[PDB]
């Protein structure tokens, strides 16, 4: 359990 | 060497961030490191530190980190790394872009290193659409570098940069025998077999490259083959929450090619499955998102014996399929055979600094 | 009247095919014929018709209805029925399951019937490759159920019914003599007959029904007998595509009665084969598929002289065999008999409302 | 002057 919890197109 | 860095910054620009590559080969026994640099200048918000994190989750609902929408998300691995103050010198083997990444920049420069365990899941999405019960899903690699005190703290979009890298994966082609497969039809009334063969150059393909099916026909019946038919069909296992078995065509020849009763026929035919047709209309397993030309149909994910399958989220696998239309003149049956194949990802390169920057962001 | 109808839905549940058993007793003469009842609704693809087909045929190398697979298949019969527009029929009459069905489904309820030819070989499955090569094969009786413009363009796994029927033998008892058979031995330096003879009930063969093997022995030497092993072994032949011979056995008793000697013994031992006890023995013989309660070693093929023995595919015997065991001083013996037996499947009891619908997917 | 259809597909499961 090591810490839990883009693409740009317009 | 014009050196291609893809810089990405800060909504409003005090944190940027910068990778080497936007894609990170697995070549089966060990993954590319994410070596990479932050560049920030202790001014804001929380004048303790800065964090960078690697996250790969299978997300179902959208295909993005959201609140809204997002019905099942499987964790499967999660990095945390303090990249402002240099957390304790026991991972400072840095890389050779690293430090001309924190040469060519300021004091503020200060790297990253994620470590990719094989096995993982290389990236992938698959849209349905009409045909089908469900929405987007898929398995993404986030790059996250964030500024806080804390890092308990609620991350801000303000602070954040967020970056979708993607894991591609890569075999290596192995030789030896070459896949074939056959089967032999008698139709009513005769005992005449009428025998199809079929066999491809190689077993592991790469994106964009053509395959080639021998094709072997004996027709001792008295019936004429009225066309062939070779095709590729991609094979995507939903394994997680909503299974599903999805199946398209991604290649299609059927040629007006006959064989005549009591004849041979034989024909090497090539063709080559691509996406860039319609792109892909749904149900298609792609390694990125629809909306860049970066991204390739989805890779074959890699089986192993022992294998935990379902923690892989979409199992896709491809096969050429050779169909045989028969009659006669003046109600008809079709005799086929199919060829599994590999469809992996070709590797980039085996072919005072000049680095120069290219907006991270896919095409 | 209590009466079972087994029925089974396409899996977008909107084709329902009925049937008023699984299993269809061929009395040498004539089949009992396949009667059933297609329920549809025309509001999917209200064009389209419903089509039902019988399909005969051996098939060879990982018997299923899958493609990845398939190495020789040989058609033995087809019959194409149009069964929701009740086209101009053959015009032989409706059976009382059929209305007793229409009056109770519907009038988007129709008929349809096959008629299974007399001489064709009953439902068999094999799986061998003890060390050496050969693979899963059998003849299977498939009825599907389909809706489609027309018989020419493919079925999808949406509308289409996929039934296996079995077809079983029955043959009635024969009159005339039991199954007998003798033999003398006479061992090195004694000149004294060794006399073994053993008989049967000619018509001995329902599925369950024991064998009861009388044994007698007049032993003039002065060897004893220390046991005595009687054993029911199948063969079969496969003798279409690649041609193979098995044996396998399929009940045992080894008595430890012993005939002195210069004496004279008898009894009878009484044996049952049974499937259960031979489950994966390589899997050899069946009438069914492993997996399903149903199955039962297969019967024995009728033949006549002249009748076409390759079209069968796998030819299926049963002998029973006895033999004396003797190691008399200080190679020990054998002196055996075998006698053969037909085994054939049982003969089925004879001689609103209750009527009471089951899947028709086996046990 | 021709023979008889040529099905494909599978039914019934086996988990």
Do not use: W
Request: net charge neutral.
């Amino acid at each position: 359990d090591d810490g839990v919890s883009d693409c740009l197109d317009q | 060497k014009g050196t291609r860095v893809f810089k990405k910054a800060s909504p409003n620009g005090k944190l940027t961030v910068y990778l080497g590559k936007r894609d990170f080969v697995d070549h089966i026994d060990l993954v590319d490191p994410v070596d990479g640099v932050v560049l920030v200048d202790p001014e804001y918000l929380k004048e303790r530190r800065v964090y960078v994190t690697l996250t790969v989750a299978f997300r179902y609902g959208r295909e993005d980190l959201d609140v809204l929408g997002l019905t099942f998300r499987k964790d499967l691995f999660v990095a945390n790394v303090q990249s402002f103050p240099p957390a304790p010198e026991d991972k400072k083997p840095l890389t050779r872009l690293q430090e001309r990444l924190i040469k060519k920049l300021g004091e503020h420069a200060y790297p990253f290193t994620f470590e990719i365990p094989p096995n993982l899941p290389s990236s992938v999405t698959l849209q349905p659409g009409p045909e089908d019960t469900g929405k987007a899903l898929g398995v993404d690699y986030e790059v996250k570098a964030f500024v806080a005190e804390n890092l308990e703290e609620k991350i801000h979009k303000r602070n954040s940069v967020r970056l979708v890298i993607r894991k591609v994966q890569y075999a290596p082609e192995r030789p030896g025998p070459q896949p074939t497969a056959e089967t032999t039809r008698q139709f009513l009334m005769s005992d005449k077999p009428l025998h199809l063969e079929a066999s491809l150059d190689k077993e592991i393909y790469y994106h964009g490259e053509p395959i080639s099916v021998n094709v072997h026909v004996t027709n001792n019946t008295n019936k004429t083959v009225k066309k062939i038919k070779i095709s590729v069909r991609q094979y995507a296992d939903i394994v997680l929450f909503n299974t599903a078995q999805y199946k398209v065509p991604v290649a299609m020849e059927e040629a007006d090619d006959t064989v005549a009763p009591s004849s041979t026929f034989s024909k090497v035919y090539t063709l080559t499955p691509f996406l860039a047709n319609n792109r892909e209309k749904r149900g298609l397993a792609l390694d990125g998102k629809l909306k860049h030309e970066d991204t390739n149909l989805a890779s074959s994910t890699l089986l192993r014996e022992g294998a935990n399958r379902e923690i892989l989220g979409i199992i896709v696998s491809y096969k050429v399929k050779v169909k045989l239309v028969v009659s006669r003149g003046g109600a008809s049956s079709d005799v086929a055979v199919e060829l599994p194949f590999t469809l992996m990802h070709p590797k980039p390169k085996e072919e005072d600094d000049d680095i120069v920057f290219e907006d991270f962001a896919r095409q």
